Design an enzyme around this catalytic site. Structure first.
Site, PDB file in Angstrom:
ATOM      1  CE1 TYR A  41      49.830  12.862  50.039  1.00 17.58           C
ATOM      2  CE2 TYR A  41      51.047  12.271  52.026  1.00 17.58           C
ATOM      3  CZ  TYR A  41      50.837  12.146  50.667  1.00 17.58           C
ATOM      4  OH  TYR A  41      51.631  11.289  49.947  1.00 17.58           O
ATOM      5  CG  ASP A  77      51.045  19.267  44.991  1.00 13.91           C
ATOM      6  OD1 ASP A  77      50.941  19.573  46.216  1.00 13.91           O
ATOM      7  OD2 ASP A  77      51.737  18.296  44.584  1.00 13.91           O
ATOM      8  CE  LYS A 123      56.204  23.607  47.950  1.00 18.28           C
ATOM      9  NZ  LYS A 123      56.346  22.289  48.680  1.00 18.28           N
TER      10      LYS A 123
HETATM   11  C1  PLP Z   1      53.531  13.038  47.522  1.00 15.86           C
HETATM   12  C2  PLP Z   1      53.620  13.532  48.915  1.00 15.86           C
HETATM   13  C3  PLP Z   1      54.486  12.789  50.000  1.00 15.86           C
HETATM   14  C4  PLP Z   1      55.307  11.507  49.825  1.00 15.86           C
HETATM   15  O1  PLP Z   1      54.510  10.571  50.327  1.00 15.86           O
HETATM   16  P1  PLP Z   1      54.711   9.197  50.841  1.00 15.86           P
HETATM   17  O2  PLP Z   1      53.289   9.168  51.206  1.00 15.86           O
HETATM   18  O3  PLP Z   1      55.710   9.191  52.018  1.00 15.86           O
HETATM   19  O4  PLP Z   1      54.977   8.273  49.758  1.00 15.86           O
HETATM   20  C5  PLP Z   1      54.442  13.384  51.400  1.00 15.86           C
HETATM   21  N1  PLP Z   1      53.582  14.552  51.709  1.00 15.86           N
HETATM   22  C6  PLP Z   1      52.784  15.187  50.668  1.00 15.86           C
HETATM   23  C7  PLP Z   1      51.912  16.343  51.114  1.00 15.86           C
HETATM   24  C8  PLP Z   1      52.857  14.672  49.307  1.00 15.86           C
HETATM   25  O5  PLP Z   1      52.109  15.336  48.407  1.00 15.86           O
END
Ligand code: PLP
Ligand code: B12
Ligand code: B12
Ligand code: 5AD
Ligand code: 5AD
Ligand code: PLP
Lengths: 212, 516, 516, 212
Positions: free
Chosen positions: B263, B298, B370
Site C-alpha cells: 500500500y 480494493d 474481507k
Molecule cells: C485509503 C487507505 C488508508 C488511509 O490512508 P492515508 O494514507 O493515511 O491517507 C490507510 N491504509 C489503506 C490500506 C487504505 O486503503
C-alpha cells in the site's frame, strides 16, 4: 437533514436542476443538494435532494484528450528549505487527500513528485528535463517571509533564463491564496481547502487557453 | 470449502510458490536492516511514551538521539537497556532525561554486550505478557459470548472527534455491527510520528492515537457486555509508523487492523525498502497479538477497470499471504481483501463477480476473507445503489466471505446517517437470512462463464507473479509492472530512516513474538 | 428447458392425467348447455351492438327477449338468422326492431332448420374473418418489429378515465413496457352486461368496454410504430360476461386477457355451472384469436400462507391447462401464473421461491409463464420493498419466466408515479442484464432443499388432484376441498342464466373457431 | 406529490408519528401521509412520508380470538324486492371491493351471502339457522321509500318474535347512512364510501362491547 425525492415535468436541464433547488428551499429550511437528477422522458425528469466548475477525474482526462491531445506532465515539490510535504502529497499522491485522488492517479497525466527541500535551481533543472507543462511549488513556513522570498526567487530564476511562459506555475500551502499568488508571478495559488481536482481542472483549462 | 469451480489446484500451488519465492527473496533484505520506525516501536514496547515540550513524541526524540550519534545500527533496545543498567532509572525517565539534555546514551559506558542484551530480553518479556494476556482476554470473551459463524457486519465511524466517534460506535454496536472501524485522519500514513492524546478534531476522520484506541476500546467493551457480544475494533497500520501503530494497538488490544505490504509504496509514495521493513515487524506484532489484518486490494479496483485488474488483485492477495507467513501470521488471521467493483451495466457482470469471489474463497480456504462494497459506480440514485448493495450482499452469502464491509445506499453522497446504517443492515440481514443455504444449494455448470472466468484470472495472476519473481519485488516496482505504478528503489518518502543492521543489532521482541 | 430439479416426470405425467380427467368429466356437462352470456356473445359476433333508451346493451335485450319466450335452448344464432331470412334486415336492425317492440323472433315463421342453420354459418363466417385477419395483423407486426426473447415487462395503468389511461399507457409504452394492462373497474365481473361507450370515470380503474378497447389499441398502435415495438394490450375476461368480453377483444384485438377457470366461482361467488360454460366459450374465442390468456393463481397466494398453498397453485395451473386444451388453446398461448409471495423473513425463503418457479417452468415448458410480484408483505418501507422486488426480478431471469409483471417499490402505497415506474424498470433491467446467463450457469445440488422442495409440491399437487378427480370438480367445490372455499352447486350468482341445450341448438361459431 | 424521508430522535410512538406529520406540513403544502415508521433505537425512529380506527384483516382476526374466542358468523343479503347485489358483494365476497377483501375472506369469520331479493321472513329464518351474530341488509332502490318500509318491517318482525337483541344489525346501500340507520332500529348504516374492513372493525367491537 432530510432526504427528499420527486419529479418535475421539465426536460433534463441545469435549469430544471435549479427548479429542483427552488422547489426544495421553497419548502422549509434549505441549503439543498440535488444529489441525483435523471430523466424519465425528454419532457420529464426525476429528482433526489438533501437539505435542512470543477471537472472530475473521468472528465479532466477526457478534456485532456479532446482538447490537448497528449498526456500532460506535472512536476511539483516543496521548494527551498521547507520540509513540509503532506500538502503536495495531498494533490500529487495516487491516494490523494480526503477522497480527492492525486494527479498521479490521472490517466492523461504524468505527475512527478520531487518531495521536500528542493532548491529552486534543482526544481527548474527537473522541470526542463521531464519537460513539464505544470510546475507545482508548495510552501508552508512563513517565518521571516522566507517563503515569499523563495517563491519570488524561483520566478526570477525562471525568467532570467527566459523560461517562465513555458509553464503553468501553481503555488499553494496553508498560508497561501490566489491573491498572494498572482502578485508574485504565479498563475494561481491554492489554500488549505483545495484539492487535486481543483488543481487539475485549473491547469487543464489554462493549458487549453494557452495552446488555443 | 468444496471445489465448485473445478479450479486447477496445481496451478494454484504453482502461483503460490512464486509468491513465496518473491517474498523470501525480499525477506533476505528485510532481515539485514531496521528502520527508524522499528526502533521507536521497540521503545514504546519498553514503556517510553508521552511527549516533550513542542509536542514531539518521546519515542521520536530518544530514537532521533541515537540516530544522529550513528547508533541505530545497534538498535534502541541495547542503549535503552545499557542506560537502565548503569543508571537504574526507568526507560520512561531515560527518555525525559534525554529530552532535557540531561543524559546521552552514546556516552554512557557500554557495559558487556551479553549483559545488556540479557537485560534487554528481560524487559521485552514484560510487555509481551501484557500483550499475551490481552489475547487471552479476547479468547475469554468470545467463549463467554460466542461468535457469529456467518459473515461479520463491519461498519465505519469517523467524525474526527473521538468522543463523538464513540457515541456513534456504540449506537452502531447495538444497531447490529460486529466490527467497528474508526476511519483514520486522511493522510496520517504520511506523518513520521504518532500524535499523542485524545483527538477532538480531524479532517476526513479521527487521528490514530494510543489514547484514542483506549477510549474506543473502553466504550465498545461497555456496550459489548450490554449486548452480550464482543465488538471487534479496527484501525489502520498503513504509513511511516506502521510498527508503532501496531505495538500501540497490541497494548490497547484492537482486534483487526489494515496492514498491506504494498500500500504505502504504491499509493503514498513511501520508499519500498522502508515500507518492506516496517510491514515485516508490524505483521509480527499483530500476528503474535492475535490480530486479524486486512489488506487493501480494493485500492487496485476503485479507479482502474475492475474487470481487467482482477489478476493484479489475486496476485496481491498471494503476495500478502506469503509475507504474513514469513512474519508468523497464520491464515486464520489474514483477512485478505477483494471487492464488488465491476460496472453495474456490464452484461453477466454479476456472474463474473460471483466467480472471482468464489475463486478467492477456494484459494484461501482458511482466511477470514474481507469483501468490500461497490463505490466507484455508486451514484446519487439512492434506489439503484441499495440494489447493487444487495447484489453485493448476495455474493457474500453465496461464497461464504467472513468480513463483510456493509455498503451504503448513500455511499457516493456522505458518511451514513442513522437511517443509512439501518437500511444497509436490514438489506444485508434480509439477504443473508433469505438465502442462508444458497451456497450449498448452488453449483456451477461444467465449463461455463463462471468456472472459465475464474481459471483465466488464476492463469493470469500466475503469469504476472512469474515476471514479478523474475525481477524480484524492487525491480518490479521500479518498472511499474505491478499496479500500473512505477516507483524508485531509492525514491519516495522515508528512505533516510532506513538503516542497515550492524553485527551487534538486537530486537528482543522478535524472538519473543516470532521465534521462527 | 433442461431438468435442473431432477423432477419425476412420470409423477408429472400422472398429475397431468388427473387434471385431464377432471376437465373432460366437467366438459361433458359444458357441451350439454349454454348460457345467457354465451348467446349475447353470439349476437355480438353477428354485429348486434349499441344500447336501447335506458342504456341497456342491445345484446341483452335481444337475448332477454328470446329468453322469456322459452327460446334460449335453441340459441340466438337460429332466431337471429331466421329473422334475417324472412325479413331481410340486418341483425343490428333486428335488434332495434325488437327493442321498439316492432318484431318478435318467437312468432316469425320458423323456416326450414337446415336453411337457417346454413344461413347462420354463412353469417358467422364473416366475423371469423375479421378476427382471423386481426391475428395476421399481429403476426405481421411482430415480424416487422421483432419480439424480445427474454422476459416481457408487463405494467399496469388505471385512472378510471380512458383518455387519461392512454396518456399513461403511451408514456409507459416508451418508458420501456412490453405489455400494458388497463385495470378493469373493481367488481365489473359482477355485472351481467357490458357497459357501452368510452369511459371517463370509474372506481378502482377503467370499465371494460369495446369502445374503450378500440381507443387504447389505437393509441398503443400509434406509440408502437413510434418506438418500433408492438405493445401487447391486456384486459380482464373474468365475470358474468366472459365470452362477450372475449368476443369484444377479439374484434378490437387485445393481445392478452385474464381468463381463469375457477376465479369467478371461488372469489366472486358466481355459480359453478354458469362459470364453467362461460369459460369454455371465452377460451375458444381467445384461442382462435391468437390471444395469450393469464390465469389468476396469485389470488390463492395473496392472503393464505404462500408456503403451504403452493400445491393448490400447481393444481390450479394443471387444471387451467387441461381446460384451455379442451377449448383449442395451445400451450404457447397459456400464460399460466404464479408469484413471489412468501414472507421475506422466511429462512431460505428465496431458495423455496426459486425452486417452485423453476418447477413450473419445467412442468409447462412451452407456456409463456406469468410471474407476479410480492404484494402482501410489501410495506411502507420503500427501500426494503425495492430489494424484495429485486429478489423477485432475480427469479425471473434464473428461471426464464416470460411475462414479467413488474413489482413497484410503492406497491402497498398507491398506483405508481412516473418515478415509481422508472425505478421499477431500471431495477429489472439492471438485474436482467447483470445476471443474463445466470440460468445456464446455475445448477442445483443433488438432493438439496431446492430439488426436494419442488418434488414435495409436485407430490402434494398430485395428491390433491387425485381427490378432486374422485369427486369431480362440482363436488370438490361443494365441499371446499380446493382453495379453502366451499361453494353451492346451485348457489352463487348467474345460475338462472344457465340453460340446457335442446336437440336443435347451434353455435355456428364453435365449429368455425374450434372444429375439434 | 413528494416522497420525503428522515428520522426524528423520539421513541417510536404515535406521538413521534404526529411529530412526523408536523415536521412535514411545517415544510410546505401538506396533507402528509406517514407511510412508514420504524425505530432504529428505543430513542430513535425513522420516517417515510408523502405530501403535496379501522382494524385490518390480520388484526380483526386477532381481535376475534383474544376477545371473542370463537369464529363469528355473519349473514347478509339484499332484502325484499331489491335485485341489487354488487354492494353486499363488495363487503362479503372473497375478492371484496377496491382492495378491501370481503368478510368471507376472513379467518375468524363465516360469511353467508344469501344474495338478492330475500324476503325478510326468509332472511330471519336463515339468520336463526346459521346462528348469526351479524346480520347485513343492503338496500338500493328508494322509489317510494320502499326501502325505508322494508327495513322498518324487518325490525318489527325481528322484535315481534323477541329477536332483535340477538343480533348486530347493519344496513347500508347507496342512499343509506348512519343517521338514517339509527333512527330506524339498526346499530349502524354504511354509505357508498365504506368497505368490508369498516364493517368488520365495527361488528367485532360491538360484539365485544355486548359480550363484555
Ligand atoms: C485509503 C487507505 C488508508 C488511509 O490512508 P492515508 O494514507 O493515511 O491517507 C490507510 N491504509 C489503506 C490500506 C487504505 O486503503
Ligand atoms: C506535520 C508537520 C510537520 C512535519 C512535516 C511532515 C511532512 N512530512 O510534511 C515536520 C515534523 C517535518 C515539521 C517540521 C517543522 N515544522 Co511543522 N507542522 C506540521 C503540522 C502538524 C501539519 C502540517 C500538514 O501537513 N497539514 C496538512 C496539509 C494537507 O495541509 P496544507 O499544507 O495546508 O495543504 C493544503 C493546501 O495548503 C494545499 N497545498 C499545499 N501545497 C500546495 C502546492 C500547490 C501547487 C497546490 C495547487 C496546493 C497546495 O493542499 C492541501 C489541501 O488539500 C503543522 C501544523 C498544522 N496543523 O498545520 C506544523 C507547522 C507547519 N510546523 C511549524 C513549524 C514551526 C515547523 C518547524 C520549524 C518545527 C521545528 N523543527 O522547530 C519545522 C520545519 C521544518 C522545515 N524545514 O520545513 C509551524 C509553522 C509556523 C509558520 N507559519 O512559520 C506550523 C504551522 C505549526 C505551528 N503552528 O507552530 N512539521
Ligand atoms: C348495476 C345496476 C343494476 C343491476 C344490478 C346488478 C347487480 N347484480 O346488483 C340491475 C340491472 C339488476 C339493476 C336493476 C335495476 N335498477 Co339499477 N343500477 C345499477 C347501477 C348501474 C350500479 C349499482 C352498483 O352496483 N354500484 C356499486 C356498489 C358497490 O355500490 P353501492 O350499492 O353504493 O355499495 C357501497 C355502499 O352502498 C356499501 N353497502 C351497500 N349495501 C350494504 C349493506 C351493509 C350491511 C353494509 C355494511 C354496507 C353496504 O358498500 C359499497 C361500498 O363499498 C345503478 C347506478 C349507479 N351508478 O349507482 C343503478 C340504479 C341503482 N338502478 C336503478 C334502477 C331505477 C333500477 C331498476 C328499477 C331499473 C329497471 N329495471 O327499471 C332495477 C331494479 C331491479 C330491482 N328489482 O332491484 C336506479 C335507482 C334509483 C332509486 N334510488 O330508486 C339507479 C340509482 C340508477 C339511476 N340513477 O336511475 N340495476
Ligand atoms: C511542527 C510540529 O511537528 C511535530 N513534530 C514531530 N516530530 C518533530 C520533529 N522531529 N521536529 C519538529 N517537530 C516535530 C510537533 O508536533 C511540532 O509542533
Ligand atoms: C339500472 C341500470 O342497469 C342497466 N341495465 C342493464 N341491463 C338491464 C336490464 N335488463 N334491466 C334494467 N336495467 C338494466 C341500465 O344501464 C340501467 O340504467
Ligand atoms: C382481481 C381480479 C379481477 C377483478 O375482479 P372484479 O371481480 O371484476 O372485481 C378479475 N380477474 C382476476 C383473475 C382477478 O384476480
Amino acid at each position: 437533514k432530510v432526504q427528499l425525492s420527486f419529479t418535475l415535468p421539465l426536460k433534463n436541464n441545469e435549469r430544471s436542476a435549479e427548479a429542483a433547488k427552488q422547489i426544495a428551499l421553497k419548502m422549509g429550511l434549505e441549503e439543498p443538494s440535488v444529489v441525483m437528477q435523471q430523466s424519465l422522458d425528454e419532457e420529464f425528469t426525476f429528482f433526489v435532494v438533501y437539505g435542512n466548475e470543477i471537472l472530475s477525474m473521468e472528465e479532466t482526462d477526457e478534456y485532456i484528450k479532446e482538447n490537448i491531445g497528449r498526456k500532460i506532465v506535472v512536476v511539483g515539490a516543496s521548494t527551498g528549505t521547507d520540509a513540509h510535504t503532506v500538502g503536495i502529497d495531498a494533490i500529487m499522491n495516487m491516494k490523494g487527500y480526503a477522497g480527492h485522488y492525486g494527479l498521479e492517479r490521472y490517466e492523461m497525466i504524468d505527475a512527478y513528485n520531487l518531495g521536500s527541500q528542493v532548491a529552486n535551481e534543482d526544481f527548474i533543472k527537473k522541470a526542463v528535463e521531464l519537460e513539464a507543462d505544470v510546475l507545482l511549488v508548495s510552501q508552508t513556513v512563513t517565518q521571516k517571509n522566507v517563503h515569499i522570498q523563495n517563491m519570488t526567487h524561483l520566478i526570477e530564476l525562471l525568467e532570467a533564463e527566459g523560461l517562465r511562459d513555458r509553464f503553468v506555475l501553481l503555488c499553494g500551502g496553508p498560508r497561501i491564496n490566489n491573491e498572494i499568488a498572482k502578485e508574485l508571478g504565479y498563475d494561481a495559488g491554492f489554500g488549505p481547502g483545495r484539492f487535486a481536482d481543483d488543481v487539475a481542472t485549473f491547469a487543464v483549462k489554462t493549458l487549453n487557453d494557452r495552446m488555443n | 470449502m468444496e471445489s465448485k469451480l473445478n479450479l486447477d489446484f496445481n496451478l494454484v500451488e504453482k502461483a503460490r510458490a512464486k509468491a513465496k519465492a518473491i517474498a523470501i527473496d525480499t525477506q533476505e533484505f528485510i532481515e539485514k536492516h531496521t528502520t527508524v520506525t522499528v526502533e521507536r516501536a521497540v521503545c514504546r514496547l519498553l514503556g517510553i511514551d508521552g511527549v516533550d515540550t513542542d509536542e514531539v513524541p518521546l519515542p521520536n526524540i530518544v530514537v532521533d538521539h541515537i540516530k544522529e550519534n550513528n547508533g541505530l545500527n545497534l538498535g534502541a533496545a541495547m542503549y535503552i537497556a545499557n542506560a537502565v543498567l548503569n543508571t537504574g532509572k526507568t526507560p520512561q525517565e531515560i527518555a525525559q532525561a534525554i529530552s532535557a539534555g540531561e543524559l546521552d546514551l552514546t556516552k554512557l559506558p557500554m557495559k558487556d554486550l551479553f549483559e545488556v542484551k540479557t537485560k534487554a530480553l528481560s524487559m521485552a518479556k514484560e510487555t509481551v505478557e501484557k500483550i499475551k494476556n490481552n489475547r487471552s482476554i479476547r479468547e475469554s470473551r468470545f467463549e463467554e459470548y460466542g461468535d457469529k459463524s456467518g459473515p461479520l457486519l463491519y461498519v465505519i465511524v469517523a467524525t474526527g472527534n473521538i468522543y463523538e466517534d464513540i457515541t456513534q460506535a456504540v449506537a452502531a454496536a447495538k444497531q447490529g455491527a460486529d466490527v467497528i472501524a474508526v476511519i483514520r485522519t486522511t493522510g496520517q500514513s504520511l506523518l513520521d510520528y504518532v500524535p499523542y492524546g485524545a483527538t477532538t478534531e480531524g479532517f476526513g476522520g479521527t487521528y490514530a492515537t494510543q489514547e484514542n484506541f483506549r477510549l474506543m476500546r473502553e466504550a465498545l467493551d461497555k456496550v459489548g457486555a450490554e449486548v452480550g457480544k464482543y465488538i471487534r475494533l479496527c484501525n489502520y497500520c498503513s504509513g511511516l509508523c506502521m510498527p508503532e501503530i501496531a505495538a500501540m494497538g497490541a497494548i490497547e488490544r484492537l482486534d483487526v487492523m489494515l496492514n498491506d505490504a504494498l500500500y504505502g509504496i504504491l499509493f503514498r509514495d513511501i520508499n519500498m525498502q522502508r515500507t518492506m521493513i516496517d510491514q515485516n515487524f508490524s505483521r509480527i506484532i499483530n500476528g503474535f497479538a492475535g490480530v486479524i489484518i486486512n489488506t487493501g486490494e480494493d485500492n487496485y479496483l476503485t479507479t482502474a477497470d475492475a474487470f481487467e485488474e482482477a489478476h493484479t488483485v489475486l496476485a496481491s492477495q498471494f503476495i500478502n499471504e506469503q509475507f504474513a507467513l514469513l512474519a508468523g501470521l497464520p491464515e486464520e488471521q489474514m483477512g485478505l481483501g477483494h471487492a464488488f467493483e465491476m460496472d453495474p451495466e456490464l452484461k453477466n457482470g454479476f456472474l463474473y463477480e460471483l466467480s472471482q469471489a468464489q475463486m478467492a474463497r477456494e484459494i484461501f480456504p482458511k482466511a477470514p476473507l474481507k469483501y468490500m462494497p461497490p463505490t466507484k459506480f455508486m451514484t446519487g440514485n439512492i434506489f439503484k445503489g441499495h440494489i447493487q448493495d444487495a447484489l453485493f450482499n448476495m455474493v457474500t452469502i453465496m461464497t461464504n466471505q467472513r468480513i463483510h464491509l456493509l455498503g451504503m445506499l448513500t455511499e457516493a453522497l456522505h458518511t451514513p446517517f442513522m437511517s443509512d446504517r439501518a437500511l444497509s443492515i436490514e438489506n444485508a440481514q434480509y439477504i443473508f437470512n433469505n438465502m442462508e443455504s444458497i451456497s450449498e444449494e448452488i453449483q456451477f455448470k461444467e465449463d461455463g462463464l463462471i468456472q472459465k472466468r475464474a481459471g483465466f484470472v488464476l492463469e493470469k495472476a500466475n503469469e504476472l507473479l512469474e515476471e514479478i519473481e523474475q525481477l524480484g519485488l524492487f525491480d518490479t516496482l521500479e518498472k511499474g509492472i505491478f499496479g500500473g505504478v512505477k516507483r524508485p528503489k531509492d525514491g519516495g518518502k522515508g528512505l533516510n530512516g532506513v538503516v542497515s543492521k550492524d553485527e551487534n543489532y538486537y530486537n528482543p521482541f522478535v524472538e519473543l513474538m516470532l521465534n521462527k
